[PDB]
């Protein structure tokens, strides 16, 4: 369950968006200084406090109980755009049943006169566009000229979104999840498919330059603020470690259960899966740049279509493309459906824990599933429009993988270390795990993760650069404002809860602070 679209889809395009080589240095810096400490942190908070989500910050500093509300906002927005990823994957899966895949050859209705098939491009020398980018942008995306031009609601993307939301409704509380078929399927089938796509990509001609672009850093790119924050929020994204999902996972664990080796195994496996998927996709992109005669950084989308360009293009250069296209997009749907089952189950669980007996279990709980799925549908219908990828990129940069993740991780590490105490928390960990954490975890919660999150947060503001889609489209200022509103809807869940809890507690400021930072 640490394998998913955040590994096989998000880390490749975030690496491609940030120059490839220079993305990995803040990636590993955040993975070691920040990401695995916060992973162990929320798993321990979910294990210590027997509940999770909001009411786990009741025996851990009740003043900062807004971390749960921040996680609820984050998981709602993540549910919306992560299910529209699944809608794109379903649209590709239904288009995979053709013998000749529509992104393989050049003569269709959506293709421009500037089309050329990929193997023919090196013979002709330059304003010539590959069929994978053409199929993506003008059949799947049906991409408009901006977010201020939404175009029209594209049909059958809404039907793919309806299919994946009906599968989510019929498998979360009207049904069950995978229990006995987890062996040899849905746990190693994505790893097998990643192995197949990796051994395809590494044996491709010209794929050495793609690995060179992937691994060798650009030191001048490390001074960009976007690289550090993209790497940090990619670590916090693929771990889902500002989400409440891992806190809810720790609630379904025993008290004296060893959850250190499990956490570092899951985190290192997740980051290694991301690294292997990056190897695969960037080898495919090196092959693509070799074939098309264009630069490696300009061969495909510098946005969230890289897994929908590089992987389908490698499926075309594979024996029997139809079979592997069907298996690959069923794999994408299985990864994203498992992660969406986990996150919608966590959102539903923490929302009915937020209001007990306002939603009774049984008849009215089932109505609440339909209500929340319908609301996330109507918020997801602005992403299957013509200009729906711009809304999606706004969500992916801002809603659940931006300064909100840095804010929640910094506030969790700060609350634990400097209000709850690293020594008191280590005493709790010793009582549960068996040993108190070493100086790595202690000084990461105390120094390294607050310093990294605060430094990248201020570095993304002093040298502010606007969000750009595919390196060419500058976003409008109202779109940046809407994305910042999406970020601040999670970010302001902490100080609004602080102000509310200070207002609802009587006494002077010192007495209120003392009552609300002493645990219950």
């Amino acid at each position, epitope marked *: 369950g640490f394998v998913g679209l955040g590994n096989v889809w998000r880390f490749p395009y975030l690496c491609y968006k940030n120059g490839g080589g220079a993305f990995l240095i803040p990636y590993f810096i955040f993975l070691f200084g920040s990401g695995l400490p916060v992973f162990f942190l929320e798993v321990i908070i979910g294990q210590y406090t027997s509940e999770g989500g909001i009411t786990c910050w009741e025996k851990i500093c009740p003043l900062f109980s807004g971390i749960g509300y921040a996680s609820i906002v984050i998981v709602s927005l993540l549910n919306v755009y992560y299910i529209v990823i699944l809608a794109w994957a379903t649209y590709y899966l239904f288009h995979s049943f053709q013998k000749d895949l529509p992104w393989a050859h050049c003569n269709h209705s959506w293709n421009t006169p500037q089309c050329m098939e990929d193997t023919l491009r090196r013979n002709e020398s330059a304003n010539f566009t590959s069929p994978v980018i053409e199929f993506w942008e003008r059949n799947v995306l049906s991409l408009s000229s901006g977010i201020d031009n939404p175009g029209s609601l594209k049909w059958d993307l809404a039907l793919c979104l309806l299919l994946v939301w009906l599968v989510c409704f019929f498998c979360i509380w009207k049904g069950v999840r995978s229990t006995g078929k987890v062996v040899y399927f849905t746990a190693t089938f994505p790893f097998a498919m990643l192995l197949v796509l990796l051994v395809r990509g590494l044996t491709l001609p010209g794929a050495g330059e793609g690995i060179k672009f992937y691994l060798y850093p650009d030191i001048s790119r490390l001074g960009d603020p976007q690289v550090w924050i993209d790497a940090g929020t990619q670590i916090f994204f693929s771990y889902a470690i500002c989400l409440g999902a891992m806190t809810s996972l720790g609630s379904y664990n025993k008290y*004296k259960y*060893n959850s250190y080796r499990d956490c570092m195994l899951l985190g290192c496996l997740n980051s290694g899966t991301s690294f292997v998927s990056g190897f695969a996709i960037f080898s495919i992109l090196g092959f693509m740049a070799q074939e098309q005669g264009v630069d490696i950084a300009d061969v495909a989308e510098s946005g969230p279509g890289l897994a929908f360009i590089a992987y389908p293009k490698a499926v075309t250069m594979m024996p029997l493309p139809t079979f592997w296209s069907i298996l690959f997009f069923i794999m994408l749907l299985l990864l994203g459906l498992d992660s969406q089952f986990v996150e919608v189950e966590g959102q539903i669980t923490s929302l009915v824990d937020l209001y007990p007996s306002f939603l009774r279990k049984g008849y009215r709980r089932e109505i609440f599933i339909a209500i929340l799925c319908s609301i996330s549908y109507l918020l997801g219908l602005t992403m299957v429009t013509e200009g729906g990828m711009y809304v999606f990129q706004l969500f992916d940069y801002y809603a659940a993988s931006g300064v909100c993740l840095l804010w929640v991780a910094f506030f969790e590490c700060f609350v634990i270390a400097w209000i709850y105490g690293v*020594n*008191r928390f*280590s*005493e709790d960990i*010793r*009582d549960m795990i*068996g*040993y*108190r954490p070493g100086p790595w975890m202690k000084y990461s919660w105390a120094v390294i993760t607050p310093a990294l999150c605060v430094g990248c947060f201020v570095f993304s503001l002093v040298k502010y650069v606007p969000l750009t889609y595919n390196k060419v489209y500058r976003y409008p200022d109202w779109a940046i404002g809407l994305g910042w509103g999406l970020a601040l809807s999670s970010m302001l869940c902490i100080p609004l809860v602080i102000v509310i809890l200070l207002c609802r507690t009587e006494g002077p400021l010192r007495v209120r602070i003392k009552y609300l930072i002493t645990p219950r």
Partner: antibody
Amino acid sequence: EVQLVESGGGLVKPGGSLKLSCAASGFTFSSYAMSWVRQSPEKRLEWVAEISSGGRYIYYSDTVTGRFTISRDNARNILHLEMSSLRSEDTAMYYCARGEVRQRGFDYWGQGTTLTVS
Amino acid sequence: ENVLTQSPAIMSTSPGEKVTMTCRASSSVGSSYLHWYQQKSGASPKLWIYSTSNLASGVPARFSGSGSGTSYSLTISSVEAEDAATYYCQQFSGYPLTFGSGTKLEMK
């Protein structure tokens, strides 16, 4: 060098009280959980009580679960063991044992103070 | 309680002989939490083997430990005159922490 020095060893009446005092040195006392282990005169080791590093999580054996009280002094590095309702079958040889990692066990033990019931 | 029934206390073995001693537990110990202590005659116990295999500081390499779950074993490759003491096995996972019985190694 880790040194655990015990005190308070003496003869007490049944149903009485005694103050044991494990004075530790050579290590930070606030970061290691400490335990009292007694040894019966027929040489049978028995863990009595464990206190955590901060003094918050306190565990007791089934024999002494309601009449023994273990506490620390993290400022001056002394572990205590208060006693009351001390029955006849409590004459033993009491060691203070430093066990913080549950997978390392009691790596450092103390010196010997004898409790005698008569 | 997790009663650790250990090998009988009175074992008499000549020096230089490979010896072993068992430690059966009533419950199941997680095999990273069972430790062995060597208490000499009239002296305090000291940590000898921790996490059922690793060797404590000042312990020679001739001692070794094995076993998991229920049955746990301490093994001496060759016995010398400084190995004449009582060995207690000790789970330290379950919160009523229990030591084993005696296993006193006397000479011949």
